[PDB]
Amino acid sequence: FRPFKSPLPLCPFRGFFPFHKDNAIRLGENKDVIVTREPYVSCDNDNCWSFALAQGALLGTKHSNGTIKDRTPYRSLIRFPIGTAPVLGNYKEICIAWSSSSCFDGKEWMHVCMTGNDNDASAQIIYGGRMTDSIKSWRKDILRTQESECQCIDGTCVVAVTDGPAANSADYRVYWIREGKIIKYENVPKTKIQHLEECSCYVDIDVYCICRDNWKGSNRPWMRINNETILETGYVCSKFHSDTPRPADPSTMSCDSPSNVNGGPGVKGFGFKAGDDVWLGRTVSTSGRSGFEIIKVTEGWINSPNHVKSITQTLVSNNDWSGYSGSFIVKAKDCFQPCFYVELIRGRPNKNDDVSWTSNSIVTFCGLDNEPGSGNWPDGSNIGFMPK
Amino acid sequence: FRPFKSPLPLCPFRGFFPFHKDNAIRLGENKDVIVTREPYVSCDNDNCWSFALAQGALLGTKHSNGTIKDRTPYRSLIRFPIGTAPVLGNYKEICIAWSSSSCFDGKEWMHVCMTGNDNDASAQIIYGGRMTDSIKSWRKDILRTQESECQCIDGTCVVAVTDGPAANSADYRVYWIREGKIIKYENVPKTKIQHLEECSCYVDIDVYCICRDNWKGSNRPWMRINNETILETGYVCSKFHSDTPRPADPSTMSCDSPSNVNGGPGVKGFGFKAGDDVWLGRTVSTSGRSGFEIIKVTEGWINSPNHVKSITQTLVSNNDWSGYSGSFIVKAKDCFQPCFYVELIRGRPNKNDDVSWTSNSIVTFCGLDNEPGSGNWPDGSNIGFMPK
Amino acid sequence: FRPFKSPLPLCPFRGFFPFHKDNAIRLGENKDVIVTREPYVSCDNDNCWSFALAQGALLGTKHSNGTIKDRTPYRSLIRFPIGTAPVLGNYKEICIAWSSSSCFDGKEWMHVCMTGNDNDASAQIIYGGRMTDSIKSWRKDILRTQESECQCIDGTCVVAVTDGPAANSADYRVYWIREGKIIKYENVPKTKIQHLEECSCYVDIDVYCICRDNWKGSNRPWMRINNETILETGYVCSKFHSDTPRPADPSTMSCDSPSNVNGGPGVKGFGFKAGDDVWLGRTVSTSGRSGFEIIKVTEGWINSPNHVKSITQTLVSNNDWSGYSGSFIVKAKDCFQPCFYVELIRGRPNKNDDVSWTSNSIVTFCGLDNEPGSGNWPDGSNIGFMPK
Amino acid sequence: FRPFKSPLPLCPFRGFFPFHKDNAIRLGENKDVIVTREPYVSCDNDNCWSFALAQGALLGTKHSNGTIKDRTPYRSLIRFPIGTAPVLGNYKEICIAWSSSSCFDGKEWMHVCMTGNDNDASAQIIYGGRMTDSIKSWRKDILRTQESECQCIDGTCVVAVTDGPAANSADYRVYWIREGKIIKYENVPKTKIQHLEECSCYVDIDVYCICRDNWKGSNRPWMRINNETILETGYVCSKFHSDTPRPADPSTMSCDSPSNVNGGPGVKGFGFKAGDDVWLGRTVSTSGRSGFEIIKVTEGWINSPNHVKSITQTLVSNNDWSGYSGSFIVKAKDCFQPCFYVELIRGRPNKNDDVSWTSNSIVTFCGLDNEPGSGNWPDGSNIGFMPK
Ligand SMILES: *[C@@H]1O[C@H](CO[C@@H]2O[C@@H](C)[C@@H](O)[C@@H](O)[C@@H]2O)[C@@H](O[C@@H]2O[C@H](CO)[C@@H](O)[C@H](O)[C@H]2NC(C)=O)[C@H](O)[C@H]1NC(C)=O
Ligand SMILES: *[C@@H]1O[C@H](CO[C@@H]2O[C@@H](C)[C@@H](O)[C@@H](O)[C@@H]2O)[C@@H](O[C@@H]2O[C@H](CO)[C@@H](O)[C@H](O)[C@H]2NC(C)=O)[C@H](O)[C@H]1NC(C)=O
Ligand SMILES: *[C@@H]1O[C@H](CO[C@@H]2O[C@@H](C)[C@@H](O)[C@@H](O)[C@@H]2O)[C@@H](O[C@@H]2O[C@H](CO)[C@@H](O)[C@H](O)[C@H]2NC(C)=O)[C@H](O)[C@H]1NC(C)=O
Ligand SMILES: *[C@@H]1O[C@H](CO[C@@H]2O[C@@H](C)[C@@H](O)[C@@H](O)[C@@H]2O)[C@@H](O[C@@H]2O[C@H](CO)[C@@H](O)[C@H](O)[C@H]2NC(C)=O)[C@H](O)[C@H]1NC(C)=O
Ligand SMILES: *[C@@H]1O[C@H](CO[C@@H]2O[C@@H](C)[C@@H](O)[C@@H](O)[C@@H]2O)[C@@H](O)[C@H](O)[C@H]1NC(C)=O
Ligand SMILES: *[C@@H]1O[C@H](CO[C@@H]2O[C@@H](C)[C@@H](O)[C@@H](O)[C@@H]2O)[C@@H](O)[C@H](O)[C@H]1NC(C)=O
Ligand SMILES: *[C@@H]1O[C@H](CO[C@@H]2O[C@@H](C)[C@@H](O)[C@@H](O)[C@@H]2O)[C@@H](O)[C@H](O)[C@H]1NC(C)=O
Ligand SMILES: *[C@@H]1O[C@H](CO[C@@H]2O[C@@H](C)[C@@H](O)[C@@H](O)[C@@H]2O)[C@@H](O)[C@H](O)[C@H]1NC(C)=O
Ligand SMILES: CCC(CC)O[C@@H]1C=C(C(=O)O)C[C@H](N)[C@H]1NC(C)=O
Ligand SMILES: CCC(CC)O[C@@H]1C=C(C(=O)O)C[C@H](N)[C@H]1NC(C)=O
Ligand SMILES: CCC(CC)O[C@@H]1C=C(C(=O)O)C[C@H](N)[C@H]1NC(C)=O
Ligand SMILES: CCC(CC)O[C@@H]1C=C(C(=O)O)C[C@H](N)[C@H]1NC(C)=O
Ligand SMILES: [Ca+2]
Ligand SMILES: [Ca+2]
Ligand SMILES: [Ca+2]
Ligand SMILES: [Ca+2]
Ligand SMILES: [Ca+2]
């Protein structure tokens, strides 16, 4: 017997430390590794797992040619041991999906899997291995979701979903699901948030989601949610923005609306509120998906004239390719430990990655209340060594 | 401790949704995947599994040349994680078999495995990993069985078996087996059914089997069975037939006998009775094994002048190869959820599939009481990319 | 909690039926499969397992060249799912060994593993994964053991061991081991048995071992053992001999001594006493390791003028290569089901197998109290297809 | 429920016997095996596991070229079934690390993982899969640890750590960690020990560590530790030294300080105190990492004029490459069984190993209170067969 996960506070922390790293591309040189993208991490009571959207092809084979394409019927949400490369011998196929979210509620796994035509997609709700519910596209425009772990409190899981234009006004909803059955949804208030994609969420008593505005905001939109309703929304106040592309530091302090500067497109990212402060992951480049750093902004969560980057951890050099990133939590007695993964994208359309495929490796970090050292943990592949 | 599966009613549903998909051929381009055919799905308390008849060779190797052949000593019923490709690293060999059925009774797995000479085959009964009984060919003419999951109620499993000509009058029996020991069998009444092959079965209080008449019927023969006897038989009334080959819609309403039109040969298929209505899977083509759709026929289960195709879900385009299909169930609290798999056959004898081997990938769908969207989930392989 | 296996009687049976088959050579065409020989089967409470002596090389690689050699430091007893091919992704290395025996006592696995110099080998006793005892070579001449499963009764396991010349008078012992600790041994009485190798054992109240006389006997030596001592010995009375090489049927009825005809060398084989009758496995050829059949000899266990082959099941054609064979049991409520495996040797020194390596596949059969059909289940490899 | 491991005495023993052997290089000829080094073994309640520092590349691929390099971001502590080769299908990635230690405390696994820049590395403490603590480099000079299993008593684990010059005075600490949280550390007294690296530890009531002095000592430094403090230190008295390089036998009896002869560099090794005697592993060569033997020195643990090598077991010939070695224990009722692994290094910089990569296979031995035989268990690879 296992109780449902509880609304625990976020553990104290002051730095992030290297956790698991898969070196999936390096290890895929001999065509053993499954082509993937949009990876993430989520944990149950016994293990943390790597998840990702597979492309139904092995890296370096002819079927991997052209996998830059986002949505096909041959993509499945797959799961593999955290820090290992995904191979036919160790993976599990979760569901058919070109967009997904996963979260464990203390007892069973829930998955949200979008697939089908762009104008008529549906989301399948999987609970304990069984398809228990669905969501039918209501704007008929690429129904899609987080690409990282959802969150569950006292048996009720919460997940953010979008249907509509990627570079214009769209529809954003939160769904509450309990044991695989949709209980309700809410349209996200547009009083502050103007665009919302690929939410990275975690628990700190309530569920906090820090997302991607793909339209007008170089700052990141955010939500605070409990097991019943949306409690609060806004954009991260930090005048040091964390989307890509974005303005140079310092930019505008925009707590209540998109910045309206370098607004589109964007990249999936994450953050952690810490008191009135905020930690923000981001690419080192302001324009491209290269490098990765995480900054702590003093008073960056609130409307203040005192914003300052008190810390900057450089985890992937700007000489190396990054990509998506997202939050996940690990239970730690009476608090949740904040962690994150970084997607290291190799292949198209990256400059000088002369291969026909598109894939990624994974690197992860966790927060501790200790002082960290420093280093660099990039993909590490010599693309010249790879089957094209 | 686990109780035996109960005679639960079929859950309500109004559409079918994409579940698991393995992309096994695409993934087999580098010779990692086991050659298979006659795949299916069956679930225990913890997982759903893919099953299939392997050919004792890896796809794309010289030993895969000529695997169009149906029965050899080198075929085994194998089991692999649902939605993954079958590789040496993840498969389990269940038994030697060129024809099989599998079903979980709540406590243990049962398997029925036919192998040996065509004129002197035997069926091995496996229960909890142990060979517990057997059936000796009594017509000495390719003793064979469902090629999809059997059903068990209150500890007694039911399975349909055929011995005799494939295109003429044969013998059809149902066997009741409890904990691996044959309790009894019955010869299927020929008052209505004239030919019976490859039954696709499920539970809706009683066991319903919808099968393949390979002789005179373009309509599908059916049985209703409990844990003791055959209760009812007939052919699906629907004037919209569901075998391949078959007449164009609409055809004859034949509740009580084979249609006698486009009667031979046929393809393994399935259906679900829903009140007086019936859902029927079928290839899109009336002549070939291409495409896949499932139709709901209003009042299609009964003798009525009101038959109408109220729904048509097109799940595989007619531009893509299909193959066998079959039912399986997943327990859902106090009802059984109806699902199905579709075999996507690639290689010989398919036109323009220029390879020497014969194999398949798998795609699955489950029923929900929600409105579905639409899409297309074919095999997806560029046969030109494959080792021949 | 699990009780120790009990001294159950052998189940009734009247024929043998196809069980698991791995097709390991066929499946090894692309160099995925581990080179092996001396395979066998043994079962615990949850699964039956394939065991074998690996050669520390993959089939078809340069390191597989010359694996005809019997004893090297690079051989390990490995274990893999029954009926699957042994690959790096699914095998477990049990111990370093060029000779082995394995048996489950109801609670834990025991293994006996011989390795080291021919003139100073030692046997390691493994119990529950821990090395718990050892046997030091006392004749300093290739200390060796069964190459098939041992047997355990009420917590005490029994295993036959040989140290000495392979074609002359040697030393033969039985060791009793309880929870991995050697309790005692006995020198096998030479009042009847003159040479003993590679015992195939099973339980029928007491432990019965039917072995290989590599010196003067074309008939097979046998022992009957309980958890304390050797109770009885002799040679199988059947005037229809079951070693290879051997005389044509019928030969001498030699219950009490080796036949002294076609006495050397020999092959590992098995048998099952059934009342006063005996079932005997053997190659179809009287001279070579080709084909495989099992015969039932009426009154073949006793001194009688009425010996007759009442049954002959031909399971591998004489056109196909066989090899070793051995008994194993599967618990069946209140009796033990008799089963056996057959080693299908491919490569050197087999005539027309033009490869540099030596390996094998596996096929198995179990006994039931039903009438069997017929068929042929050989290795199935086209050696011309294989990497040399 | 499982209690924490207890402070059990070391079991009696008088020899060492072949246990598991992986033949990883031989088996890696077809590019399936992960490049590794610094391997070791550690056991939980159910299994013994192989651990190693992977290089994030497959053996024989272009990414394996130049893996002689000690520290990169692409190295992870990985775990695989004991005696199997590490492949993508069977490995688990434990943590990012170019230096590590692992030990099971009776309930959960603990890992210590060093990674990052040489001048700013950190050690991550993993407990039950969760990162629970860290150590920040305090000398900023390659923070590093044992490369073999740590030890845990009554819930408190002990691990030796070094930060500083490799060939000069450095800092050496022991950390006590309970359930993943650092309780305390102590600076190792330099009253006797002058240099300490790569400690090989085991339990004999208290924790004994026998280590590597890389500076002035051809004799090995040692510590005795309980769950609270360092109790004792020194160098192994044995005038028969056990580091590499070292003087010819006999050398100086140096119980209290480094020998000051052939002092640098060194190799990771191990030993077992047995009463006043000591068993010592070592390479057969006094200068190179070739061959492996273990000697028992009478009164070699104490200050005595009676030192004599009473036993010498030659386990790897001097014609074969060895490498690191280390102790591990296996619980045996009411005592701990002493065992050890030997790293068999192949590739650079070994003379005549003409490949660009650097990797290793593994062989292991355990102690029993019986007389052993003899043999030779080297890597066994023909380097000429390998992909370069
Ligand atoms: C990756 O694929 C492209 C495109 O492949 C072509 O179209 C595909 C859909 C498929 O049908 C293939 O068979 C086709 O070749 C390759 O680009 C082609 O390369 C050929 C040969 O050099 C050239 O003649 C064509 O003009 C190219 N076609 C296009 C549309 O650009 C490319 O070579 C592949 N890359 C790798 C590394 O294999
Ligand atoms: C698939 O196999 C066929 C047939 O293989 C032949 O017969 C088999 C039983 C086996 O013994 C093989 O060694 C034989 O080659 C192949 O067709 C043959 O191809 C050869 C060479 O082109 C030709 O000379 C023969 O006439 C063909 N034989 C027949 C009976 O058609 C075919 O090439 C194989 N396909 C692939 C993709 O390898
Ligand atoms: C299988 O191996 C034999 C022998 O290999 C030789 O000796 C081995 C120990 C090893 O050191 C190899 O490098 C040696 O080649 C091979 O037989 C040799 O073949 C070569 C080349 O044709 C020939 O010149 C030698 O005379 C042969 N040596 C002997 C002793 O017969 C054989 O080719 C290998 N078989 C395969 C399929 O690779
Ligand atoms: C192992 O690698 C070396 C070095 O590789 C070179 O530098 C690497 C960092 C990488 O960038 C490679 O692309 C480079 O080739 C190889 O040595 C080189 O070999 C080439 C071709 O013979 C020669 O022209 C260069 O001078 C060499 N470079 C150096 C620095 O020595 C070597 O061939 C590789 N070994 C194997 C077995 O592949
Ligand atoms: C929602 O969860 C509640 C949990 O208890 C408390 O109330 C909620 C609103 C949060 O503030 C949480 O942190 C508190 O601990 C339950 O009381 C309530 O029954 C749940 N409601 C539903 C719809 O399940
Ligand atoms: C068969 O199973 C019965 C189950 O109970 C009920 O009766 C059967 C005939 C069905 O109608 C089922 O739906 C009902 O729930 C048992 O009563 C009976 O003992 C069983 N008989 C055998 C041969 O096992
Ligand atoms: C040996 O096992 C005995 C088992 O009980 C019976 O006696 C033996 C000799 C056999 O005939 C068996 O079939 C019987 O069931 C135990 O009585 C005895 O204690 C055991 N002795 C040892 C040495 O463990
Ligand atoms: C340390 O462990 C102790 C174990 O009991 C005994 O005392 C120690 C010092 C050793 O001598 C051991 O062999 C003995 O069995 C506990 O008493 C003590 O509470 C523990 N202290 C800490 C810090 O956990
Ligand atoms: C369609 C909108 C959406 C969010 C901006 O596009 C995405 C951005 C992507 C990106 O910027 O890398 C790739 C994604 N896999 C994707 N999601 C889907 C379903 O295609
Ligand atoms: C022998 C009759 C039988 C049913 C019509 O033939 C089948 C039809 C087949 C088909 O139409 O694809 C292939 C099958 N694997 C098969 N079953 C066996 C045992 O060979
Ligand atoms: C050394 C005597 C022994 C029994 C006759 O030889 C064997 C017969 C063999 C055989 O006839 O195939 C091969 C064996 N693997 C073997 N056992 C060992 C340890 O080498
Ligand atoms: C930096 C000091 C240290 C101990 C002498 O060097 C080592 C010796 C090595 C050796 O002699 O083989 C290789 C090691 N993997 C290593 N440890 C690290 C972290 O690089
Ligand atoms: Ca943006
Ligand atoms: Ca038909
Ligand atoms: Ca003989
Ligand atoms: Ca491969
Ligand atoms: Ca030294």
TrEMBL record, chains A, B, C, D:
Subunit and interaction comment: Homotetramer.
Entry note about domains: Intact N-terminus is essential for virion morphogenesis. Possess two apical sorting signals, one in the ectodomain, which is likely to be a glycan, and the other in the transmembrane domain. The transmembrane domain also plays a role in lipid raft association.
Cysteine disulfide partners in this protein: C11-C335, C43-C48, C95-C113, C103-C150, C152-C157, C199-C211, C201-C209, C237-C255, C339-C366
Highest taxon in the source lineage: Viruses
Binding, Ca(2+) 2: D213, G217, D243, G263, P265
Residues involved in Ca(2+) 1 binding: D32
Region described as Head of neuraminidase: spans on this chain: 10-388
Enzyme Commission number, as recorded: 3.2.1.18
PTM comment: N-glycosylated.
Binding site for substrate: R37, R71, E197, E198, R212, R289
Membrane topology (UniProt): Single-pass type II membrane protein
Family: Belongs to the glycosyl hydrolase 34 family.
Keywords assigned by UniProt, alphabetized: Calcium, Disulfide bond, Glycoprotein, Glycosidase, Host cell membrane, Host membrane, Hydrolase, Membrane, Metal-binding, Signal-anchor, Transmembrane, Transmembrane helix, Virion
Location in or out of the cell: Host membrane; Virion membrane; Host apical cell membrane
Identification of the protein by name: Neuraminidase
Notes on how activity is controlled: Inhibited by the neuraminidase inhibitors zanamivir (Relenza) and oseltamivir (Tamiflu). These drugs interfere with the release of progeny virus from infected cells and are effective against all influenza strains. Resistance to neuraminidase inhibitors is quite rare.
Reactions the enzyme catalyzes: Hydrolysis of alpha-(2->3)-, alpha-(2->6)-, alpha-(2->8)- glycosidic linkages of terminal sialic acid residues in oligosaccharides, glycoproteins, glycolipids, colominic acid and synthetic substrates
Binding site for Ca(2+): D213, G217, D243
The protein's role, per its UniProt record: Catalyzes the removal of terminal sialic acid residues from viral and cellular glycoconjugates. Cleaves off the terminal sialic acids on the glycosylated HA during virus budding to facilitate virus release. Additionally helps virus spread through the circulation by further removing sialic acids from the cell surface. These cleavages prevent self-aggregation and ensure the efficient spread of the progeny virus from cell to cell. Otherwise, infection would be limited to one round of replication.
Cellular component, GO annotation: host cell plasma membrane; membrane; virion membrane
One GO biological process term: carbohydrate metabolic process
Cofactor: Ca(2+)
Enzyme active site: D70, Y324
Organism in which the protein naturally occurs: Influenza A virus
Single GO molecular function: metal ion binding
